[PDB]
């Protein structure tokens, strides 16, 4: 079945560095739906939770969602459909502190990974 490698982590980083948030996944033969990936942020700063930061669907990337991370989030892989939904959060700030969730779907497959990012 559909799985992510290391379904929970903590990454310690310093301000102005770029955090490599890994999300490597394995596909099952039954996973026949469209690959459907999203990363979310639960910021420690405020009340809102589970806020999209970047998206991959229809073999296209969409990233204009979270104003704070504008121009600072991107998928690292040139071949994301092969099993790598990892992202970079460049030029880390104090306000980036929070839980980052990677959700991979490829129906019936569903997996997610939470990373607690500390800056």
């Amino acid at each position: 079945s559909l799985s992510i490698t290391t379904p929970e982590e903590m990454i310690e980083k310093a301000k102005g560095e770029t955090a490599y948030l890994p999300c490597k996944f394995t596909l099952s033969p039954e996973d026949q739906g469209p690959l459907d990936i999203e990363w979310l942020i639960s910021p420690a700063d405020n009340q809102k939770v589970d806020q999209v930061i970047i998206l991959y669907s229809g073999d296209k990337i969409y990233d204009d969602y979270y104003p704070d991370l504008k121009g600072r989030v991107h998928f690292t892989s040139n071949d994301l459909k092969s099993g790598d939904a990892s992202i970079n959060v460049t030029n880390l700030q104090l306000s980036d502190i929070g839980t980052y969730q990677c959700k991979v779907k490829k129906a019936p497959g569903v997996a997610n990974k939470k990373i607690h990012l500390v800056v």
């Binding site: 204009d64 969602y65 129906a107």
Partner: protein, 182 residues
């Protein structure tokens, strides 16, 4: 037999406005003996997280072929998780079946476009159902769209009912239409 087609629980951002996926749509089409119940809810994201009274109205169109398969051409389309709900679990089974047609709007009953406009409460728990926190959602059944055999449009209307900026976190909306025959 009955058949349910759905987005699954915890749906992705699967509703495109102006070529960008911005609305997170929970959509269940449950066919029982004759009628299909549409059970659906929506959460605006990014620029659509909060909507204001001046928000322009928009349609999220689902296009389906003759066999009840979601096409790639709608605002909600086959690039997102969508498929059959097995009885007994919350999986989304993407493998087509002939039974999928049964969730479609009967093309003889709906040989011209049909509609149901209903109240669509926004953020209803948090705003405690304040009357000025509702918009409208209209389901349009089989409004023609390109090469689609069936269409279901969720049209969000009358944002100017809102007193002010409201979280675009809709109520659970229900609609009903006659199901297609196998």
């Amino acid at each position: 037999a009955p058949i349910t087609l759905w987005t699954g629980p915890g749906p992705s951002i699967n509703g495109f406005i102006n070529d960008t996926p911005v609305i997170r749509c929970f959509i269940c089409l449950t066919r029982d003996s004759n009628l299909v119940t549409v059970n659906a809810s929506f959460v605006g994201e990014g620029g659509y997280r909060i909507v204001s009274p001046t928000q322009s109205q928009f349609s999220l169109i689902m296009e389906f072929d003759q066999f009840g398969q979601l096409m790639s051409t709608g605002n909600i389309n086959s690039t997102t998780t969508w498929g059959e709900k097995p009885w007994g679990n919350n999986t989304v089974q993407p493998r087509p079946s002939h039974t999928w047609k049964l969730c479609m709007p009967n093309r003889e009953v709906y040989s011209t476009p049909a509609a149901t406009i209903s109240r669509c409460g926004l953020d209803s728990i948090a705003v405690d159902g304040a009357p000025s926190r509702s918009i409208d959602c209209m389901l349009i059944i089989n409004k023609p769209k390109g090469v689609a055999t069936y269409t279901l449009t969720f049209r969000f209307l009358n944002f100017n009912r809102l007193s002010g900026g409201t979280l675009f976190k809709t109520d659970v909306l229900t609609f009903t239409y006659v199901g297609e025959n196998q």
